Design a protein around this motif. Structure first.
Motif, short mmCIF file in Angstrom:
data_model
loop_
_atom_site.label_atom_id
_atom_site.label_comp_id
_atom_site.label_asym_id
_atom_site.label_seq_id
_atom_site.Cartn_x
_atom_site.Cartn_y
_atom_site.Cartn_z
N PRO A 172 56.94 48.46 63.32
CA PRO A 172 57.55 49.58 62.60
C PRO A 172 56.57 50.64 62.13
O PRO A 172 56.93 51.82 62.09
CB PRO A 172 58.24 48.90 61.41
N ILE A 173 55.34 50.28 61.75
CA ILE A 173 54.37 51.30 61.37
C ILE A 173 53.98 52.14 62.58
O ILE A 173 53.90 53.37 62.49
CB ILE A 173 53.14 50.65 60.71
N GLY A 176 56.94 54.47 63.29
CA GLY A 176 57.05 55.55 62.33
C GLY A 176 55.93 56.56 62.45
O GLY A 176 56.15 57.76 62.24
N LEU A 179 56.91 58.65 65.53
CA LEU A 179 57.99 59.54 65.12
C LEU A 179 57.42 60.77 64.40
O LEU A 179 57.75 61.91 64.75
CB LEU A 179 58.96 58.79 64.21
N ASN A 180 56.55 60.55 63.42
CA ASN A 180 56.07 61.65 62.59
C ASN A 180 55.07 62.53 63.33
O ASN A 180 55.07 63.75 63.16
CB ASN A 180 55.45 61.10 61.30
N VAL A 183 57.08 64.79 65.32
CA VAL A 183 57.61 65.88 64.50
C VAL A 183 56.52 66.91 64.24
O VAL A 183 56.76 68.12 64.25
CB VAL A 183 58.20 65.35 63.19
N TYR A 186 56.35 69.12 67.20
CA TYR A 186 57.50 70.01 67.36
C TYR A 186 57.50 71.10 66.30
O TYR A 186 57.71 72.28 66.60
CB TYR A 186 58.80 69.21 67.28
N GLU A 187 57.27 70.73 65.04
CA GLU A 187 57.51 71.62 63.92
C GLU A 187 56.27 72.40 63.50
O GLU A 187 56.40 73.53 63.02
CB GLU A 187 58.04 70.81 62.73
N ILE A 224 64.18 52.36 63.55
CA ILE A 224 63.27 53.49 63.74
C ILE A 224 63.43 54.08 65.13
O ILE A 224 63.27 55.29 65.32
CB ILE A 224 61.82 53.05 63.47
N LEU A 227 65.85 56.81 65.13
CA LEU A 227 65.37 58.08 64.63
C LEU A 227 64.68 58.88 65.73
O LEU A 227 64.83 60.10 65.81
CB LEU A 227 64.42 57.86 63.46
N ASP A 230 67.52 60.26 67.65
CA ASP A 230 68.11 61.40 66.95
C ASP A 230 67.34 62.68 67.24
O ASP A 230 67.93 63.73 67.52
CB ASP A 230 68.15 61.16 65.44
N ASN A 231 66.00 62.61 67.16
CA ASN A 231 65.18 63.80 67.39
C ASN A 231 65.27 64.27 68.84
O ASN A 231 65.38 65.47 69.10
CB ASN A 231 63.72 63.52 67.00
N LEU A 234 68.37 66.12 69.25
CA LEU A 234 68.31 67.43 68.61
C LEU A 234 67.46 68.39 69.43
O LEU A 234 67.76 69.59 69.50
CB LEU A 234 67.74 67.29 67.20
N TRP A 235 66.39 67.89 70.05
CA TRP A 235 65.39 68.74 70.68
C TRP A 235 65.67 69.03 72.14
O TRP A 235 65.02 69.92 72.71
CB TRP A 235 64.01 68.08 70.56
N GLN B 2 68.03 68.46 60.64
CA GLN B 2 66.63 68.31 60.28
C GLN B 2 65.96 67.27 61.17
O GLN B 2 66.60 66.33 61.65
CB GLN B 2 66.50 67.90 58.81
N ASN B 3 64.67 67.46 61.39
CA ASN B 3 63.89 66.46 62.11
C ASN B 3 63.80 65.18 61.30
O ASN B 3 63.57 65.21 60.08
CB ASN B 3 62.48 66.98 62.41
N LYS B 4 63.98 64.05 61.97
CA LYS B 4 63.84 62.76 61.31
C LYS B 4 62.36 62.36 61.21
O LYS B 4 61.62 62.45 62.19
CB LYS B 4 64.61 61.67 62.07
N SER B 5 61.94 61.94 60.02
CA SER B 5 60.62 61.36 59.82
C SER B 5 60.78 60.09 58.98
O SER B 5 61.83 59.88 58.38
CB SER B 5 59.69 62.34 59.12
N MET B 6 59.75 59.26 58.89
CA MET B 6 59.85 58.12 57.99
C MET B 6 58.56 57.92 57.19
O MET B 6 57.51 58.45 57.54
CB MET B 6 60.19 56.84 58.77
#
Ligand SMILES: [Ca+2]
Ligand SMILES: [Ca+2]
Ligand SMILES: [Mg+2]
Ligand SMILES: [Mg+2]
Ligand SMILES: [Mg+2]
Ligand SMILES: [Mg+2]
Ligand SMILES: [Mg+2]
Ligand SMILES: [Mg+2]
Lengths: 236, 6, 236, 6
Positions: A172-173, A176, A179-180, A183, A186-187, A224, A227, A230-231, A234-235, B2-6
């Motif tokens: 999970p780490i 995550g 995932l971040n 992001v 992307y952002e 996770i 998630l 989900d992104n 969206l993307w 919104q973009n998902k983060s954790m």
């Protein structure tokens, strides 16, 4: 520090009470005091630290976005002049947000990261360093924006390198972090293709490792993975 | 969204 | 005060921005600064003041109830001893809640109430005085509990007397005052029959006055009448 | 439930 006179165990106990009461500013102050005792943090204690500051800065980021939107509208064509108040209050919230980010980064630098030797702790803290530089990057506009962005990138990259060598793809780490970092691409870094590629590869490699897991670990990992999905939805 | 983060 | 250097109009402007950003602590501090400018408050400004502190103390009350519940459980038969931490942290939140209540009551006493001559402002402020003594009463346990309760009762009663003489039965301030006085009777004064009688009579007298109202006023009044109905359904 | 106030 105001928590210097309280026992480490009492600070942890009260952090858990503050979470139950949804008093996340208190929770963060308690966990900051626990970190400043100088001992390394357990897995549970690390997640109390992250939960607390994630909630504090999460509220500040949401407020900053509301105010920034109002400020941008005020500067469109045909918008009536209303004075310096919108900018001033956006600046006030922005400065408090930056202060919280600086506080977290200061804890990581003094001295959580340097004492963290196990993959689970080191990756966790480097992900956190990337996250809070990313939040600084969300509001950055000046001479240091590029250096702030590269600081986030460098922390995420070091964490990614360790996670791929030392953790399974379903950890999970690790998930995550990816995932971040996706992001971030992307952002923050204007790299949507990198964001999409990372999310897809992370999802697919985790899918192929699910068969090794218990039911409880399967639940942790698939949560996770959703998630990431989900992104991607969206993307793309 | 919104973009998902954790 | 930290708001002494900011224009009254700027404080009001920023209070509205803080509400949009759900930054209610900021909103309260801005409106406290506006009150301390010394001029009377408009109808809109009074409701900005009440919204801000209602949200601040609302979060504190919810947190206090969580902690108080944990503390009561810790003192049941067969509960393991965990030290002073639960009591200490409940006391910390309780003291901050009392501080906010004292701040609001101080604004009412210096000098909002004494300058308020119109029924709409005077009833509004006396209702607020009753409300914040009621919140003090929710956590009171010592020598002054009875005097705190009577202070809430006396403020509510003065507001009720004025509202019945000077306002129509559908006036939203009159209705909200009666709703809250009824809750005071039920929750604080151990007088459920008084709470029920007041809520019923208030509801019925408003029902009979609805025919005088515009569509917009009808909506305002029926919204609060539903809250009286909700309580009657809960209490009977 | 909780008592309604306004
Ligand atoms: Ca170590
Ligand atoms: Ca007057
Ligand atoms: Mg010790
Ligand atoms: Mg400001
Ligand atoms: Mg700035
Ligand atoms: Mg002036
Ligand atoms: Mg405490
Ligand atoms: Mg006390």
């Amino acid at each position: 520090g105001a928590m210097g006179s309280m026992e480490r165990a009492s600070l942890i106990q009260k952090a858990k009470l503050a979470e139950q009461a949804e008093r996340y500013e208190d929770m963060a102050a308690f966990m900051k005091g626990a970190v400043e005792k100088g001992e390394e943090l357990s897995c549970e204690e690390r997640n109390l630290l992250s939960v607390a500051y994630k909630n504090v800065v999460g509220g500040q980021r949401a407020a900053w976005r509301v105010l920034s939107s109002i400020e941008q509208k005020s500067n469109e064509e045909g918008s009536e002049e209303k004075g310096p108040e919108v900018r001033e209050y956006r600046e006030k919230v922005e400065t408090e947000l930056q202060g919280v980010c600086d506080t977290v980064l200061g804890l990581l630098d003094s001295h959580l990261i340097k004492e963290a030797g196990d993959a689970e702790s080191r990756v966790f803290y480097l992900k956190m360093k990337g996250d809070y530089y990313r939040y600084l990057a969300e509001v950055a506009t000046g001479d240091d924006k590029k250096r702030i962005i590269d600081s986030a990138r460098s922390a995420y990259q070091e964490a990614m390198d360790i996670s791929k060598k030392e953790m399974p793809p379903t950890n999970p780490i690790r998930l995550g972090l990816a995932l971040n970092f996706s992001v971030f691409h992307y952002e923050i870094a204007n790299s949507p293709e990198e964001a999409i590629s990372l999310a897809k590869t992370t999802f697919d490699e985790a899918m192929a490792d699910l068969h090794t897991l218990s039911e409880d670990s399967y639940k942790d990992s698939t949560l996770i993975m959703q998630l990431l999905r989900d992104n991607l939805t969206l993307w793309t | 969204l919104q973009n998902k983060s954790m």
